[PDB]
Amino acid sequence: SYVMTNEDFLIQGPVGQLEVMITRPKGIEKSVTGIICHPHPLHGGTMNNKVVTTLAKALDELGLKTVRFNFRGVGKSQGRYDNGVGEVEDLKAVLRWVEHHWSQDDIWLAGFSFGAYISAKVAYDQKVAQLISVAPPVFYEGFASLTQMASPWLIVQGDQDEVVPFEQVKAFVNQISSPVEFVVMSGASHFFHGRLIELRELLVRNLA
Ligand code: NA
């Protein structure tokens, strides 16, 4: 499907255009596409966030096309913040767009913090081949109900994350019924400053 690679472009979202960028892998391209959601739009989170980039690099290394996008209101994406509700619809729109362009592909959903919540919400509604959360903000009220996730779920978490505390994520992983692959980076903060190479390696190791 003719879609320019490694450049920002716009697609139709629920409330306006969504800014998207895709990548295509450098070797065998698997019939799996990963969509990666960014951290909190109200705290400067965008599709260009470095943890988002790292997730994309990991998925690319694994042979997946990747799709990153800005939630409504962010960057060139039109509209305004919608309480985590419309943001779910934004991801759902990007997901439909992926399914339209690559109908044969399985889907991976991934996200960092706010984006981990949004992607988990969608993966709870539509079983996908793999869900990936980095620093899922499990204190969000909307996380409480995500107890029987059908999609396989990898959670990567720094144990020195002060924004999303390890013990809270651990407790969430413990309380939910469905199995989670819970991978912890020792000494990593919420932002993985200087640990992005290791984060990529950790993702690849656990997703290969
Ligand atoms: Na966030």
Ligand code: NA
């Ligand atoms: Na905007």
